[PDB]
């Protein structure tokens, strides 16, 4: 699978302390939440520290499989 076209409530995912995301994903700005696919593509946020699907993907993947709709 690649990217996601559904919900992106990654908040509890990385905001609660997932992988590297929490640290950089939400710190450089605050993408710890749907932000993953709202205004900028996870590839843009990660561009901060210089990551990419690294932490971003690790989330949209584990999230869509653990926080589907609700």
From Swiss-Prot:
Q: Which signals induce this protein? A: Stress-induced increase in the mitochondrial levels is seen.
Tissue expression remark: Highly expressed in testis and thymus, followed by small intestine, placenta, colon, pancreas and ovary. Weakly expressed in breast.
Q: Where is this cross-link: Glycyl lysine isopeptide (Lys-Gly) (interchain with G-Cter in ubiquitin)?
A: 43, 49
Q: What the entry says about post-translational processing?
A: Ubiquitinated by the SCF(FBH1) E3 ubiquitin ligase complex, regulating RAD51 subcellular location and preventing its association with DNA. Ubiquitinated by RFWD3 in response to DNA damage: ubiquitination leads to degradation by the proteasome, promoting homologous recombination.
Report the locations given in the UniProt record: Nucleus; Cytoplasm; Cytoplasm, Perinuclear region; Mitochondrion matrix
Q: What sequence ranges are listed for the domain HhH?
A: 33-62
Q: Which residues carry the post-translational modification Phosphotyrosine, per the record? A: 39
Which ranges does the record mark as transmembrane?
Answer: none
- Disulfide-bonded cysteines: none
Its domain description in UniProt is: The nuclear localization may reside in the C-terminus (between 259 and 339 AA).
Q: How does it assemble?
A: Forms linear homooligomers, giving rise to a RAD51 nucleoprotein filament, which is essential for strand-pairing reactions during DNA recombination. Interacts with BRCA1 and either directly or indirectly with p53. Interacts with XRCC3, RAD54L and RAD54B. Interacts with the BCDX2 subcomplex RAD51C:RAD51B. Component of the homologous recombination repair (HR) complex composed of ERCC5/XPG, BRCA2, PALB2, DSS1 and RAD51. Interacts directly with PALB2 which may serve as a scaffold for a HR complex containing PALB2, BRCA2, RAD51C, RAD51 and XRCC3. Interacts with RAD51AP1 and RAD51AP2.
Which family, according to the similarity comment? Answer: Belongs to the RecA family. RAD51 subfamily.
Q: What is the official name of this protein in its record?
A: DNA repair protein RAD51 homolog 1
Organism, as annotated: Homo sapiens (Human)
Chain's gene name: RAD51
Q: Which residues of the full protein are shown?
A: 16 to 85 of 339
């Amino acid at each position: 699978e690649e990217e996601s076209f559904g919900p992106q409530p990654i908040s509890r995912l990385e905001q609660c302390g997932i992988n590297a995301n929490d640290v950089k994903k939400l710190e450089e700005a605050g993408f710890h939440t749907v932000e993953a696919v709202a205004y900028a593509p996870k590839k843009e946020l990660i561009n901060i520290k210089g990551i990419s699907e690294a932490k971003a993907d690790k989330i949209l993947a584990e999230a869509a499989k653990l926080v589907p709709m609700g």
